[PDB]
Amino acid sequence: SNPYQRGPNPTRSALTADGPFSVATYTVSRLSVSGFGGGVIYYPTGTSLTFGGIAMSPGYTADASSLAWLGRRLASHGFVVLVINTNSRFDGPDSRASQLSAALNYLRTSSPSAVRARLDANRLAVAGHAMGGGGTLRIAEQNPSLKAAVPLTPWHTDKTFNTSVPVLIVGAEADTVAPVSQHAIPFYQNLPSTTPKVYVELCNASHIAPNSNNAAISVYTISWMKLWVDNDTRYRQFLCNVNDPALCDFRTNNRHCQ
């Protein structure tokens, strides 16, 4: 039996709305932490269980509020989620990677009492938007103990990341900030062939698709985190043998399906 399993048997519908756990928030001021700009922690309340943790980075010029819906959404499905602010809104992808690393260390070692109560510090993952998604790829390369990485419409000038952390990339077909032909798709192709990987391309979507409630992003992000952070194979069904009308491409090496 699986000790990390949380929540009822999933349906796709349920993964497009906030989940079964009530969500508490904690605002982390920038001056209260070293190595990153604070942010917002979304975490389960009204529960005695523990959950894996996720550090999430916004993109260039953006703040944590640009991913608030997704922090809340993930927390409500059973995760402790710190959406960071960066030291400067102009920080690049590799700076964002360093700040994600600082944020993960903060979650494990110096986060608030109520947050530590809910966190299994052994089970951590990362996600990020745009330059924050480039930062997600880089920290995955740096920290093979991470359980999963979800780069959303990622941007980076480097195209090849040597990581074994399971990666699910979301591209936006009509992205003109991080065009999929130059960013997301090369990232996917250049990851090692042995790394479990998925690429989903949102039909006729812009770069800012991750910044508001988005059913596809919700389904794939929750499912990848459940599968890898919680070992929760009930979520394989949403990631394997996918036909989804919101997607205009779906690619995988199928390592996650068995």
XYZ file of N, CA and C in Angstrom:
774
model
N 0.844 -1.219 0.000
C 0.000 0.000 0.000
C 0.876 1.266 0.000
N 0.308 2.317 -0.601
C 1.043 3.521 -0.852
C 0.757 4.559 0.222
N 1.759 4.888 1.113
C 1.562 5.853 2.212
C 1.432 7.329 1.850
N 1.793 7.644 0.606
C 1.745 9.000 0.102
C 0.469 9.355 -0.650
N -0.413 8.402 -0.846
C -1.623 8.629 -1.604
C -2.568 9.550 -0.817
N -3.114 10.536 -1.499
C -4.040 11.482 -0.919
C -5.218 11.674 -1.833
N -6.380 11.921 -1.219
C -7.571 12.306 -1.948
C -8.295 11.121 -2.579
N -9.495 11.382 -3.069
C -10.281 10.320 -3.656
C -9.788 9.926 -5.031
N -10.320 8.811 -5.558
C -9.969 8.432 -6.901
C -10.251 9.615 -7.838
N -9.296 9.986 -8.702
C -9.454 11.178 -9.529
C -10.344 10.950 -10.743
N -11.046 11.995 -11.100
C -11.693 12.120 -12.419
C -11.111 13.336 -13.127
N -11.146 13.362 -14.455
C -10.551 14.496 -15.154
C -11.250 15.795 -14.725
N -12.593 15.744 -14.597
C -13.360 16.883 -14.205
C -12.820 17.487 -12.900
N -12.556 16.619 -11.928
C -12.128 17.068 -10.631
C -10.770 17.774 -10.717
N -9.961 17.429 -11.711
C -8.636 18.049 -11.876
C -8.661 19.367 -12.596
N -9.849 19.867 -12.955
C -10.019 21.173 -13.580
C -10.577 22.225 -12.595
N -10.681 21.859 -11.325
C -11.193 22.759 -10.315
C -10.357 22.513 -9.060
N -10.526 23.367 -8.039
C -9.774 23.159 -6.801
C -10.235 21.824 -6.190
N -9.325 21.165 -5.524
C -9.491 19.835 -5.053
C -10.021 19.735 -3.644
N -9.839 18.566 -3.030
C -10.529 18.236 -1.792
C -9.987 18.903 -0.528
N -8.778 19.474 -0.584
C -8.148 20.021 0.608
C -8.413 21.526 0.692
N -8.756 21.966 1.878
C -8.821 23.413 2.149
C -7.412 23.968 2.114
N -7.321 25.223 1.672
C -6.030 25.876 1.458
C -5.845 27.048 2.401
N -4.712 27.015 3.094
C -4.231 28.152 3.881
C -3.152 28.849 3.061
N -3.001 30.153 3.312
C -1.911 30.928 2.703
C -1.041 31.575 3.748
N 0.243 31.724 3.411
C 1.180 32.414 4.256
C 2.004 33.314 3.349
N 2.020 34.625 3.614
C 2.764 35.537 2.804
C 4.146 35.689 3.418
N 5.167 35.371 2.632
C 6.586 35.435 3.018
C 7.139 36.783 2.509
N 7.512 37.673 3.459
C 8.023 38.957 3.042
C 9.434 38.785 2.450
N 9.811 39.671 1.524
C 11.128 39.529 0.854
C 12.259 39.675 1.839
N 12.104 40.546 2.850
C 13.213 40.781 3.731
C 13.309 39.671 4.796
N 12.295 38.769 4.905
C 12.340 37.750 5.923
C 13.184 36.538 5.518
N 13.597 36.431 4.252
C 14.298 35.294 3.738
C 15.518 35.761 2.956
N 16.529 34.914 2.952
C 17.728 35.077 2.184
C 17.686 34.153 0.968
N 18.162 34.672 -0.152
C 18.382 33.859 -1.320
C 17.220 33.903 -2.311
N 16.091 34.565 -1.977
C 14.968 34.758 -2.833
C 14.118 35.893 -2.260
N 13.101 36.299 -2.987
C 12.284 37.468 -2.672
C 11.009 37.202 -1.929
N 10.951 36.129 -1.159
C 9.732 35.763 -0.486
C 8.706 35.147 -1.445
N 7.435 35.388 -1.187
C 6.383 34.824 -2.014
C 5.174 34.468 -1.188
N 4.441 33.476 -1.679
C 3.210 33.033 -0.997
C 3.272 31.518 -0.913
N 3.049 30.986 0.292
C 2.887 29.550 0.492
C 1.422 29.201 0.507
N 1.011 28.258 -0.335
C -0.349 27.697 -0.345
C -0.206 26.290 0.227
N -0.986 25.932 1.227
C -0.749 24.639 1.845
C -2.036 24.116 2.435
N -2.169 22.785 2.575
C -3.442 22.229 3.104
C -3.649 22.634 4.553
N -4.929 22.816 4.881
C -5.343 23.004 6.262
C -6.570 22.162 6.517
N -6.934 22.049 7.787
C -7.990 21.144 8.143
C -7.641 19.679 7.950
N -6.357 19.364 8.079
C -5.840 18.013 7.888
C -4.628 17.792 8.793
N -4.459 16.516 9.147
C -3.341 16.038 9.907
C -2.280 15.338 9.048
N -2.503 15.256 7.741
C -1.566 14.510 6.850
C -0.408 15.400 6.431
N 0.619 14.743 5.895
C 1.722 15.427 5.295
C 1.712 15.237 3.783
N 2.396 16.132 3.097
C 2.308 16.228 1.629
C 3.677 16.617 1.105
N 3.911 16.317 -0.166
C 5.103 16.816 -0.823
C 5.065 18.335 -1.046
N 6.245 18.877 -1.328
C 6.401 20.284 -1.543
C 6.833 20.643 -2.937
N 6.384 21.806 -3.374
C 6.673 22.334 -4.721
C 7.110 23.782 -4.580
N 8.244 24.112 -5.189
C 8.656 25.525 -5.334
C 8.389 25.918 -6.795
N 7.745 27.083 -6.958
C 7.314 27.550 -8.281
C 7.804 28.958 -8.519
N 8.367 29.209 -9.714
C 8.860 30.511 -10.086
C 8.019 31.175 -11.169
N 7.637 32.445 -11.003
C 7.064 33.225 -12.083
C 8.156 33.559 -13.104
N 7.714 34.244 -14.158
C 8.583 34.696 -15.231
C 9.076 36.109 -15.091
N 9.792 36.530 -16.117
C 10.417 37.848 -16.197
C 9.394 38.928 -16.034
N 9.680 39.882 -15.133
C 8.865 41.029 -14.790
C 7.606 40.666 -14.015
N 7.343 39.389 -13.728
C 6.112 38.965 -13.112
C 6.278 38.753 -11.625
N 5.164 38.788 -10.913
C 5.244 38.446 -9.514
C 4.509 37.156 -9.239
N 4.587 36.715 -7.997
C 3.947 35.460 -7.556
C 2.454 35.443 -7.870
N 1.799 36.604 -7.911
C 0.376 36.650 -8.191
C 0.045 36.098 -9.576
N 1.012 36.101 -10.485
C 0.785 35.577 -11.827
C 0.578 34.080 -11.846
N 0.910 33.380 -10.762
C 0.700 31.937 -10.654
C -0.125 31.589 -9.420
N -0.781 32.569 -8.813
C -1.577 32.303 -7.602
C -2.643 31.230 -7.852
N -3.294 31.259 -9.013
C -4.385 30.299 -9.229
C -3.822 28.876 -9.202
N -2.603 28.714 -9.732
C -1.990 27.392 -9.855
C -1.409 26.938 -8.534
N -0.854 27.877 -7.747
C -0.400 27.510 -6.401
C -1.543 26.981 -5.562
N -2.662 27.730 -5.605
C -3.849 27.321 -4.888
C -4.377 25.988 -5.421
N -4.462 25.877 -6.750
C -4.985 24.686 -7.341
C -4.171 23.455 -6.885
N -2.834 23.533 -6.991
C -2.025 22.395 -6.574
C -2.195 22.131 -5.083
N -2.136 23.174 -4.246
C -2.272 22.933 -2.812
C -3.573 22.226 -2.487
N -4.652 22.627 -3.169
C -5.972 22.069 -2.914
C -6.076 20.604 -3.308
N -5.158 20.101 -4.132
C -5.091 18.717 -4.462
C -4.069 17.937 -3.604
N -3.444 18.617 -2.651
C -2.599 17.987 -1.640
C -1.099 18.182 -1.841
N -0.667 19.444 -1.791
C 0.743 19.790 -1.889
C 0.963 21.066 -1.068
N 2.204 21.200 -0.582
C 2.667 22.461 -0.025
C 3.370 23.222 -1.152
N 2.887 24.407 -1.508
C 3.381 25.084 -2.711
C 3.842 26.491 -2.366
N 5.142 26.749 -2.574
C 5.701 28.109 -2.393
C 5.904 28.712 -3.777
N 5.066 29.720 -4.084
C 5.242 30.525 -5.298
C 6.135 31.687 -4.933
N 7.337 31.730 -5.483
C 8.295 32.760 -5.090
C 8.033 34.079 -5.782
N 8.470 35.162 -5.095
C 8.926 36.350 -5.755
C 10.446 36.321 -5.850
N 10.978 36.925 -6.915
C 12.400 36.964 -7.088
C 13.009 38.217 -6.461
N 14.307 38.140 -6.215
C 15.047 39.263 -5.678
C 14.821 40.515 -6.504
N 14.889 40.397 -7.821
C 14.515 41.433 -8.732
C 13.542 40.823 -9.757
N 12.549 41.615 -10.182
C 11.651 41.159 -11.211
C 12.385 40.903 -12.534
N 13.617 41.424 -12.678
C 14.386 41.298 -13.915
C 15.357 40.131 -13.885
N 15.335 39.326 -12.831
C 16.283 38.195 -12.746
C 16.057 37.218 -13.913
N 17.157 36.669 -14.425
C 17.100 35.733 -15.518
C 16.839 34.304 -15.070
N 16.848 33.366 -16.029
C 16.463 31.987 -15.708
C 17.393 31.298 -14.734
N 18.704 31.517 -14.874
C 19.649 30.820 -14.006
C 19.627 31.419 -12.599
N 19.374 32.719 -12.487
C 19.113 33.320 -11.168
C 17.843 32.712 -10.557
N 16.808 32.533 -11.379
C 15.590 31.916 -10.882
C 15.824 30.501 -10.380
N 16.702 29.733 -11.067
C 17.086 28.415 -10.578
C 17.698 28.494 -9.187
N 18.627 29.433 -8.973
C 19.259 29.586 -7.670
C 18.224 29.938 -6.598
N 17.245 30.768 -6.962
C 16.202 31.191 -6.023
C 15.218 30.067 -5.714
N 14.918 29.209 -6.700
C 14.149 28.027 -6.440
C 14.893 27.131 -5.454
N 16.228 27.024 -5.597
C 16.993 26.166 -4.678
C 16.915 26.733 -3.247
N 17.032 28.063 -3.141
C 16.919 28.710 -1.832
C 15.518 28.514 -1.238
N 14.504 28.587 -2.106
C 13.116 28.421 -1.658
C 12.851 27.009 -1.169
N 13.401 26.002 -1.871
C 13.245 24.609 -1.407
C 13.937 24.420 -0.060
N 15.146 24.959 0.066
C 15.844 24.814 1.353
C 15.059 25.499 2.490
N 14.516 26.679 2.215
C 13.661 27.381 3.149
C 12.442 26.525 3.520
N 11.767 25.936 2.543
C 10.594 25.104 2.872
C 10.956 23.988 3.828
N 12.083 23.326 3.563
C 12.517 22.141 4.360
C 12.979 22.551 5.773
N 13.528 23.747 5.933
C 14.353 24.039 7.133
C 13.865 25.232 7.953
N 13.120 26.182 7.377
C 12.883 27.441 8.106
C 11.534 28.069 7.778
N 10.612 27.276 7.226
C 9.251 27.715 6.913
C 8.407 27.746 8.186
N 7.218 28.359 8.127
C 6.431 28.496 9.352
C 6.028 27.149 9.934
N 5.760 27.170 11.249
C 5.353 25.951 11.952
C 4.227 25.192 11.257
N 3.165 25.882 10.881
C 2.006 25.213 10.322
C 2.338 24.585 8.952
N 3.282 25.193 8.229
C 3.723 24.699 6.933
C 4.594 23.461 7.125
N 5.574 23.521 8.030
C 6.417 22.344 8.329
C 5.552 21.177 8.775
N 4.460 21.440 9.513
C 3.586 20.390 9.947
C 2.989 19.599 8.795
N 2.772 20.278 7.648
C 2.123 19.691 6.496
C 3.097 19.134 5.476
N 4.386 19.354 5.649
C 5.373 19.045 4.617
C 6.153 17.793 4.935
N 6.236 16.901 3.940
C 7.191 15.812 3.925
C 8.385 16.330 3.143
N 9.433 16.722 3.861
C 10.589 17.385 3.279
C 11.407 16.450 2.374
N 11.094 15.142 2.368
C 11.730 14.177 1.514
C 11.238 14.146 0.064
N 10.136 14.827 -0.216
C 9.431 14.685 -1.491
C 9.155 16.092 -2.041
N 10.039 16.552 -2.936
C 10.023 17.908 -3.420
C 10.053 17.936 -4.943
N 9.447 18.968 -5.523
C 9.412 19.171 -6.961
C 9.457 20.669 -7.283
N 9.598 20.970 -8.563
C 9.674 22.344 -9.008
C 8.767 22.576 -10.223
N 8.358 23.832 -10.393
C 7.617 24.240 -11.575
C 7.896 25.728 -11.804
N 7.577 26.220 -13.001
C 7.819 27.633 -13.237
C 7.338 28.053 -14.593
N 7.046 29.341 -14.705
C 6.585 29.944 -15.946
C 7.691 30.735 -16.645
N 7.944 30.395 -17.928
C 8.695 31.299 -18.818
C 10.162 31.324 -18.374
N 10.765 32.457 -18.045
C 12.108 32.362 -17.486
C 12.132 31.498 -16.226
N 11.011 31.484 -15.483
C 10.904 30.574 -14.340
C 10.902 29.106 -14.732
N 10.366 28.806 -15.918
C 10.458 27.487 -16.493
C 11.870 27.132 -16.959
N 12.605 28.119 -17.499
C 14.034 27.886 -17.717
C 14.749 27.589 -16.427
N 14.403 28.317 -15.361
C 14.991 28.046 -14.046
C 14.664 26.662 -13.515
N 13.447 26.190 -13.824
C 13.023 24.827 -13.442
C 13.895 23.781 -14.119
N 14.172 23.964 -15.418
C 15.029 23.016 -16.110
C 16.432 23.027 -15.514
N 16.959 24.230 -15.225
C 18.310 24.289 -14.679
C 18.375 23.654 -13.282
N 17.447 23.960 -12.382
C 17.554 23.373 -11.057
C 17.375 21.856 -11.146
N 16.552 21.354 -12.082
C 16.459 19.934 -12.259
C 17.798 19.304 -12.590
N 18.573 20.003 -13.410
C 19.905 19.532 -13.761
C 20.796 19.521 -12.511
N 20.640 20.533 -11.647
C 21.498 20.701 -10.485
C 21.137 19.768 -9.314
N 19.887 19.308 -9.240
C 19.360 18.646 -8.042
C 18.599 17.388 -8.462
N 19.308 16.271 -8.722
C 18.653 15.048 -9.165
C 17.717 14.403 -8.127
N 17.757 14.862 -6.866
C 16.843 14.336 -5.875
C 15.398 14.864 -6.045
N 15.213 15.903 -6.846
C 13.853 16.382 -7.083
C 13.022 15.290 -7.730
N 11.732 15.235 -7.373
C 10.858 14.202 -7.877
C 10.289 14.487 -9.258
N 10.131 15.767 -9.605
C 9.502 16.139 -10.852
C 9.809 17.606 -11.125
N 9.648 17.969 -12.404
C 9.800 19.338 -12.860
C 8.745 19.611 -13.919
N 8.083 20.759 -13.802
C 7.068 21.181 -14.773
C 7.373 22.604 -15.256
N 8.114 22.698 -16.389
C 8.352 23.990 -17.039
C 7.124 24.370 -17.892
N 6.532 25.527 -17.583
C 5.363 26.044 -18.278
C 5.820 27.178 -19.225
N 5.502 27.015 -20.506
C 5.922 27.929 -21.588
C 7.339 28.417 -21.337
N 8.323 27.501 -21.163
C 9.625 27.873 -20.650
C 10.465 28.666 -21.657
N 11.370 29.468 -21.117
C 12.329 30.279 -21.881
C 13.692 30.087 -21.282
N 14.679 29.843 -22.168
C 16.074 29.785 -21.774
C 16.930 29.899 -23.024
N 18.078 30.562 -22.941
C 18.992 30.595 -24.043
C 19.780 29.330 -24.240
N 20.004 28.566 -23.169
C 20.581 27.234 -23.260
C 19.446 26.248 -23.593
N 19.751 25.251 -24.429
C 18.696 24.352 -24.957
C 18.811 22.908 -24.464
N 19.959 22.533 -23.905
C 20.202 21.180 -23.490
C 20.445 21.106 -21.993
N 19.555 20.370 -21.289
C 19.664 20.205 -19.844
C 19.869 18.729 -19.513
N 20.946 18.468 -18.791
C 21.323 17.122 -18.429
C 20.677 16.772 -17.105
N 19.402 16.387 -17.161
C 18.674 16.032 -15.969
C 18.013 14.691 -16.139
N 17.908 13.967 -15.044
C 17.183 12.736 -14.943
C 15.851 12.899 -14.223
N 15.550 14.104 -13.732
C 14.276 14.367 -13.035
C 13.157 14.286 -14.085
N 12.039 13.604 -13.798
C 10.961 13.560 -14.781
C 10.421 14.947 -15.113
N 10.330 15.248 -16.414
C 9.976 16.571 -16.875
C 8.686 16.522 -17.731
N 7.725 17.380 -17.403
C 6.560 17.605 -18.260
C 6.604 19.087 -18.650
N 6.789 19.342 -19.954
C 6.811 20.678 -20.508
C 5.447 21.027 -21.120
N 4.940 22.206 -20.778
C 3.772 22.746 -21.444
C 4.231 23.834 -22.415
N 3.986 23.636 -23.713
C 4.184 24.697 -24.693
C 2.839 25.329 -25.050
N 2.920 26.577 -25.513
C 1.758 27.283 -26.042
C 1.974 27.494 -27.515
N 1.082 26.944 -28.355
C 1.323 26.934 -29.808
C 1.727 28.297 -30.342
N 0.999 29.348 -29.946
C 1.143 30.673 -30.547
C 1.982 31.575 -29.666
N 2.848 31.022 -28.843
C 3.735 31.785 -27.960
C 4.748 32.562 -28.806
N 4.772 33.882 -28.643
C 5.760 34.708 -29.344
C 6.864 35.201 -28.406
N 6.754 34.923 -27.108
C 7.806 35.291 -26.123
C 8.844 34.186 -26.063
N 8.373 32.934 -25.924
C 9.208 31.717 -25.846
C 8.695 30.752 -26.919
N 8.893 31.083 -28.195
C 8.306 30.257 -29.246
C 8.683 28.781 -29.087
N 7.683 27.917 -29.260
C 7.911 26.507 -28.985
C 9.011 25.924 -29.866
N 9.138 26.420 -31.111
C 10.145 25.887 -32.004
C 11.577 26.156 -31.522
N 11.720 27.220 -30.702
C 13.054 27.656 -30.233
C 13.319 27.293 -28.779
N 12.266 27.042 -27.975
C 12.363 26.854 -26.529
C 11.801 25.473 -26.185
N 10.483 25.405 -25.920
C 9.897 24.163 -25.393
C 10.299 22.896 -26.151
N 10.175 22.901 -27.501
C 10.405 21.682 -28.245
C 11.877 21.267 -28.193
N 12.837 22.181 -28.479
C 14.241 21.821 -28.247
C 14.505 21.304 -26.843
N 13.905 21.952 -25.826
C 14.154 21.462 -24.458
C 13.751 19.992 -24.336
N 12.554 19.689 -24.820
C 12.036 18.326 -24.775
C 12.960 17.357 -25.499
N 13.316 17.705 -26.730
C 14.115 16.808 -27.552
C 15.519 16.610 -27.000
N 16.062 17.633 -26.351
C 17.439 17.591 -25.922
C 17.627 17.001 -24.543
N 16.557 16.811 -23.778
C 16.649 16.066 -22.551
C 17.129 14.662 -22.870
N 17.837 13.986 -21.941
C 18.254 12.607 -22.202
C 17.045 11.736 -22.580
N 17.299 10.789 -23.488
C 16.254 9.881 -23.948
C 15.772 8.954 -22.833
N 16.613 8.799 -21.804
C 16.306 7.969 -20.660
C 15.520 8.687 -19.597
N 15.329 10.009 -19.695
C 14.597 10.761 -18.683
C 13.113 10.656 -18.990
N 12.242 10.288 -18.021
C 10.794 10.316 -18.311
C 10.406 11.733 -18.676
N 9.773 11.878 -19.853
C 9.461 13.210 -20.317
C 8.154 13.204 -21.095
N 7.457 14.327 -20.986
C 6.216 14.602 -21.736
C 6.300 16.028 -22.252
N 5.791 16.252 -23.460
C 5.555 17.557 -24.016
C 4.090 17.653 -24.387
N 3.393 18.667 -23.870
C 2.022 18.960 -24.294
C 2.016 20.349 -24.909
N 1.336 20.516 -26.051
C 1.254 21.807 -26.706
C -0.204 22.248 -26.698
N -0.484 23.390 -26.043
C -1.835 23.926 -25.964
C -2.199 24.558 -27.325
N -3.332 24.109 -27.880
C -3.805 24.655 -29.154
C -4.067 26.129 -29.031
N -3.523 26.869 -30.009
C -3.815 28.279 -30.211
C -3.755 29.098 -28.924
N -2.741 28.823 -28.092
C -2.555 29.492 -26.829
C -1.404 30.477 -26.907
N -1.492 31.515 -26.075
C -0.423 32.456 -25.946
C 0.507 32.115 -24.770
N 1.598 32.874 -24.707
C 2.561 32.765 -23.637
C 1.947 32.904 -22.259
N 0.864 33.685 -22.148
C 0.287 33.936 -20.830
C -0.794 32.931 -20.417
N -0.963 31.860 -21.156
C -1.922 30.854 -20.791
C -1.712 30.381 -19.356
N -0.467 30.172 -18.877
C -0.271 29.718 -17.494
C -0.678 30.690 -16.400
N -0.983 31.943 -16.750
C -1.281 32.944 -15.760
C -2.755 33.102 -15.407
N -3.601 32.222 -15.909
C -4.974 32.193 -15.453
C -5.469 30.773 -15.531
N -6.559 30.526 -14.826
C -7.152 29.195 -14.719
C -7.222 28.536 -16.094
N -6.625 27.350 -16.213
C -6.461 26.684 -17.495
C -6.617 25.197 -17.223
N -7.652 24.592 -17.789
C -7.999 23.234 -17.461
C -6.874 22.289 -17.823
N -6.298 22.429 -19.022
C -5.237 21.503 -19.427
C -4.021 21.611 -18.512
N -3.584 22.861 -18.260
C -2.436 23.010 -17.399
C -2.711 22.378 -16.038
N -3.920 22.593 -15.527
C -4.303 22.009 -14.235
C -4.183 20.475 -14.269
N -4.809 19.862 -15.262
C -4.800 18.389 -15.358
C -3.372 17.849 -15.410
N -2.547 18.392 -16.332
C -1.228 17.800 -16.527
C -0.290 18.075 -15.371
N -0.390 19.299 -14.811
C 0.502 19.634 -13.699
C 0.148 18.814 -12.445
N -1.155 18.771 -12.112
C -1.533 17.954 -10.966
C -1.105 16.518 -11.191
N -1.378 15.983 -12.385
C -1.134 14.569 -12.609
C 0.350 14.232 -12.549
N 1.188 15.066 -13.151
C 2.632 14.777 -13.112
C 3.158 14.838 -11.678
N 2.709 15.854 -10.930
C 3.144 15.951 -9.536
C 2.642 14.778 -8.701
N 1.358 14.402 -8.896
C 0.845 13.236 -8.152
C 1.653 11.979 -8.458
N 1.881 11.730 -9.753
C 2.537 10.491 -10.148
C 3.923 10.371 -9.533
N 4.689 11.467 -9.569
C 6.095 11.407 -9.188
C 6.357 11.799 -7.751
N 5.689 12.844 -7.250
C 5.903 13.260 -5.855
C 5.268 12.274 -4.889
N 4.096 11.740 -5.262
C 3.346 10.839 -4.354
C 3.420 9.397 -4.779
N 4.082 9.082 -5.906
C 4.073 7.710 -6.460
C 2.626 7.264 -6.737
N 1.765 8.205 -7.079
C 0.333 7.914 -7.118
C -0.066 7.515 -8.536
N -0.059 6.196 -8.765
C -0.293 5.657 -10.109
C -1.742 5.787 -10.567
N -2.632 6.227 -9.689
C -3.988 6.535 -10.115
C -4.019 7.689 -11.134
N -2.903 8.456 -11.209
C -2.849 9.593 -12.128
C -2.192 9.265 -13.469
N -1.700 8.034 -13.631
C -1.174 7.623 -14.904
C -2.206 7.785 -16.032
N -3.487 7.522 -15.723
C -4.502 7.549 -16.723
C -4.623 8.872 -17.466
N -4.250 9.975 -16.828
C -4.348 11.297 -17.440
C -3.145 11.651 -18.277
N -2.105 10.828 -18.207
C -0.785 11.067 -18.807
C -0.381 10.052 -19.842
N -1.215 9.039 -20.041
C -0.896 7.957 -20.922
C -2.084 7.757 -21.846
N -1.809 7.538 -23.110
C -2.896 7.309 -24.074
C -3.871 8.479 -24.006
N -3.309 9.682 -24.148
C -4.043 10.964 -24.081
C -4.575 11.295 -25.501
N -5.866 11.540 -25.566
C -6.491 12.304 -26.567
C -7.324 13.386 -25.728
N -6.786 14.761 -26.155
C -7.322 15.884 -25.368
C -7.499 17.030 -26.351
N -8.744 17.530 -26.615
C -8.957 18.529 -27.648
C -8.318 19.884 -27.396
N -7.878 20.152 -26.153
C -7.166 21.382 -25.853
C -5.702 21.308 -26.347
N -5.202 20.153 -26.734
C -3.823 19.963 -27.157
C -3.758 19.811 -28.676
N -2.729 20.450 -29.199
C -2.406 20.300 -30.601
C -1.146 19.463 -30.824
N -0.459 19.063 -29.750
C 0.549 18.031 -29.817
C 0.670 17.409 -28.436
N 1.125 16.159 -28.419
C 1.416 15.410 -27.218
C 2.552 14.448 -27.580
N 3.703 14.570 -26.907
C 4.818 13.706 -27.156
C 5.319 13.123 -25.840
N 5.813 11.889 -25.871
C 6.375 11.272 -24.685
C 7.219 10.085 -25.089
N 8.186 9.745 -24.228
C 8.885 8.482 -24.329
C 8.190 7.364 -23.528
N 7.078 7.641 -22.876
C 6.194 6.596 -22.302
C 6.854 5.836 -21.162
N 7.882 6.373 -20.511
C 8.525 5.712 -19.379
C 7.640 5.718 -18.133
N 6.716 6.664 -18.045
C 5.884 6.908 -16.864
C 4.659 6.035 -16.845
N 4.389 5.263 -17.881
C 3.092 4.622 -18.053
C 3.031 3.227 -17.435
N 4.153 2.734 -16.924
C 4.240 1.411 -16.317
C 5.535 1.338 -15.532
